[PDB]
Write a protein that binds this ligand. Structure first.
Ligand code: R75
Ligand code: R75
Ligand code: MG
Ligand code: MG
Ligand code: ZN
Ligand code: ZN
Lengths: 326, 326
C-alpha cells in the first residue's frame, strides 16, 4: 500500500504548475481526474462549503472519468485532470485573491473537469463534414462543446452522483449558466473574440485597494473565467518540456488518426493531420506564435507579474522547438 | 371529392396576405403544410430550378407534417403553413424584387416549414425550469429552435425524403447554414437584437431610384431574411380579423394549458398563461404595441412603403381588440 503513499506525495504538488500528471495517472490506477478533483475540493474546502457528500463526489468523479475515452491519445481523462489542475493554480494567483465567490470557483473547476467529456478524438469540422449525428443534433454550432456540457450535466442524474444536491435552487441555476458559458468558450472558433475581449480588459484594467482585480459585473467576471479555463486548455506549451513533449506526441497521434480517416473517406486532409506531409516542430512553433503566446502574454498582463514564470517557460519551450528545426 | 375543387380555388390566392389557411387545412384532410409548400414551390418554379423529384417533395412534407403534434393548439402544422405562405408573400415584396437568389429563396421557405416541428406546446423557459431532456441536450440555449432544426434535417434521411438530393454539395452546405441561421432567429430571445439590427439598417438604407434595396454582404442579407421569417412568424395580428381571432383562441389555449402544468407542478405562472387572471384582449394589444407593431413598422420603413397595407391592417386589429376592452 506504499503506492498510495507515493501518489499522496505527488498530490502535494497540486498547487504547483508542472504537476507530474502522467505519473499521478499511473499511481492512481488511471484515475487522475478523480484523485486530482478530490484533492482540489479538499484543498479549497469545497466538500464542506457546499455540503458535498464524499461518497457522492467520488461516485460522480469516477463516472465522469469513465466517460472520457481511454483510447483517444489527447482528449482523455488525463487532459481533463490537467486542465482542472491548471485552472486550480490559475484561480490561486495573487491578483485574483478573494475575487471570485465559492460558487464561481466551483463552476470553473467543474467546467474544467467536464469540458472535453466523451470527446471522440476528431474535430468539430470533421464531425460537420462527415454529417455526424452530433453535428446534426447541434446544427454545426460548437458541436463537441455542447455535447461535453450535456454529458457532464446528465451524469449528475446517475444514482448518488448529484454532487450539487445541497446547493440552493438559485445556486444551481447560477452555476449551470456559468459552466455553460465557460465550456462553450473552449471552442477555438471563439478564440479570436475571446482574446480581443481579454486585451480590452487589460487595456482598461481596474484594481481594488487590496491590489486584486476589480470585476463588478457578470460580463467581466465570466470573461475572466472563460479565458482562465481557455488558458488552462492551451497550457501544454507553458509546462516543463518533458510534459509538453508528451502532450505534443499525443495530439499528433490524434491528428494523424483523423487525417487517416479523412483519407479513407476521400476528404481533404485537415491541416497538420497528414502524417505523410506534416512538420510537428513547425506546427508547435506556429501554434505558440499565433495562438498560445498571444493568449498567455495577454493573461500575464492581466495578472502581472504573477504569471511571469509560466510565460518564461513558454518562451523557453518555443526557443527549444525552434532549435529542433535547423 | 368536391373538396379538391374547393381546395383548388383557395390556393389561387397563395400570393396574397390573408390566405384562408384554416379552410385549406380542413379542405385538405389536415395537410395544409404539404399543399401550401407544394403550391409555392410550383409558383416560384423551385422543383425545376433545383431538380426536386415531386414525389420526394410529397414524401418528406408528409413526414415533416406528421412530426407536428396534433394535440397542440397553435404550434402545429397549420401554423407551419401560415408562416410559409407569409414568408412567400414577403419575398415577393417589390422593394425586394429578385434581391435574394434562388437558394436564398429556398432557404427562407424551407426554414419556415420546419421552424416549429415537434413543438411540445411549452416554451423554452418552461423546458429550462423543468430540467427537461431538451434543455439538458441544448444547454438552455434556443432549446426548441435547435430541436426544430435537428428534427427537420433528420427527416431528410428517411426513405425518399432527401429533397436536396440533386443540389451540389456547396449548395447543400450553403442551404444548411442559412436554414440554421433563420430558424435560430425565430427564438424570441433574439427579437430585440434582430429589431436593433433592423433599426440600424433602416438608418443606413441604400436603395435604387426605383427604390429597391441593395444588400451586398451576407450579414446584411441574412439579417433581412431572419427578420423576414420572424415577421411571418409574428404575422397573426396583421392578417384579416377572422384569421387573427382564430390564431388567438389557439395560442391562448396553449398558454393556459402550460399555465395549468406550471400550477400542478407548483411553479411560477408564465405571463398570460394563468386562465384565472388572464386578459386575452389586453395581452393582444400589448403584444402588438410592444412587439408586433415596432417590428412591422421598422420593417415597413426598410421597405417604404410596400408594407403600408400590412401596417394598416395591424393597426386596425389593434384598434378592434382595444375596443373589446371595456
Ligand atoms: C486550430 C489551430 C491549432 O493548431 C494546433 C496545432 C497543434 C496543437 C494544437 C493546435 C490548435 C488549436 O488551437 C487546438 C485547440 C484545442 Br482546445 C484543441 O482541442 C485542438 Br485538437 C487544437
Ligand atoms: C413574449 C411576448 C408574447 O406575448 C404574446 C401574447 C400573445 C401571442 C404571442 C405573444 C408573444 C410572443 O412574442 C410569442 C412569439 C412566438 Br414566435 C411564440 O411562439 C409565442 Br407562443 C409567443
Ligand atoms: Mg474541447
Ligand atoms: Mg418557434
Ligand atoms: Zn480541452
Ligand atoms: Zn412559429
Amino acid at each position: 500500500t506504499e503506492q498510495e503513499d507515493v501518489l499522496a506525495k505527488e498530490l502535494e504538488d497540486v498547487n504547483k504548475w508542472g504537476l507530474h500528471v502522467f505519473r499521478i495517472a499511473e499511481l492512481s490506477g488511471n484515475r487522475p481526474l478523480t484523485v486530482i478533483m478530490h484533492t482540489i475540493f479538499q484543498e479549497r474546502d469545497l466538500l464542506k462549503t457546499f455540503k458535498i457528500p464524499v461518497d457522492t463526489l467520488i461516485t460522480y468523479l469516477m463516472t465522469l472519468e469513465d466517460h472520457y475515452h481511454a483510447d483517444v491519445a489527447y482528449h482523455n481523462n488525463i487532459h481533463a485532470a490537467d486542465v482542472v489542475q491548471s485552472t486550480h493554480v490559475l484561480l490561486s494567483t495573487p491578483a485574483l485573491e478573494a475575487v471570485f465567490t465559492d460558487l464561481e470557483i466551483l463552476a470553473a473547476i467543474f467546467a474544467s473537469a467536464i469540458h472535453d467529456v466523451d470527446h471522440p478524438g476528431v474535430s468539430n469540422q470533421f464531425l460537420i463534414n462527415t454529417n455526424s449525428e452530433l453535428a446534426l443534433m447541434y446544427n454545426d454550432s460548437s458541436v463537441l462543446e455542447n455535447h461535453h456540457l450535456a454529458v457532464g450535466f446528465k451524469l449528475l442524474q446517475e444514482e448518488n452522483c448529484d454532487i450539487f444536491q445541497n446547493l440552493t435552487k438559485k445556486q444551481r441555476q447560477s452555476l449551470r449558466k456559468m459552466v455553460i458559458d465557460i465550456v462553450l468558450a473552449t471552442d477555438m472558433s471563439k478564440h479570436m473574440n475571446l482574446l480581443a475581449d481579454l486585451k480590452t480588459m487589460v487595456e482598461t484594467k481596474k484594481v481594488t485597494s487590496s491590489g486584486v482585480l476589480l470585476l463588478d459585473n457578470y460580463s467581466d467576471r465570466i470573461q475572466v473565467l472563460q479565458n482562465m479555463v481557455h488558458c488552462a486548455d492551451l497550457s501544454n506549451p507553458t509546462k516543463p518540456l518533458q510534459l509538453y513533449r508528451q502532450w505534443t506526441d499525443r495530439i499528433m497521434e490524434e491528428f494523424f488518426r483523423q487525417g487517416d480517416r479523412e483519407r479513407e473517406r476521400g476528404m481533404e486532409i485537415s491541416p497538420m493531420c497528414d502524417k505523410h506531409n506534416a512538420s510537428v516542430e513547425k506546427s508547435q512553433v506556429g501554434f505558440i506564435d499565433y495562438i498560445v503566446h498571444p493568449l498567455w502574454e495577454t493573461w500575464a498582463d492581466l495578472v502581472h507579474p504573477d504569471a511571469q514564470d509560466i510565460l518564461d517557460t513558454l518562451e523557453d519551450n518555443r526557443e527549444w522547438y525552434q532549435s529542433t528545426i535547423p
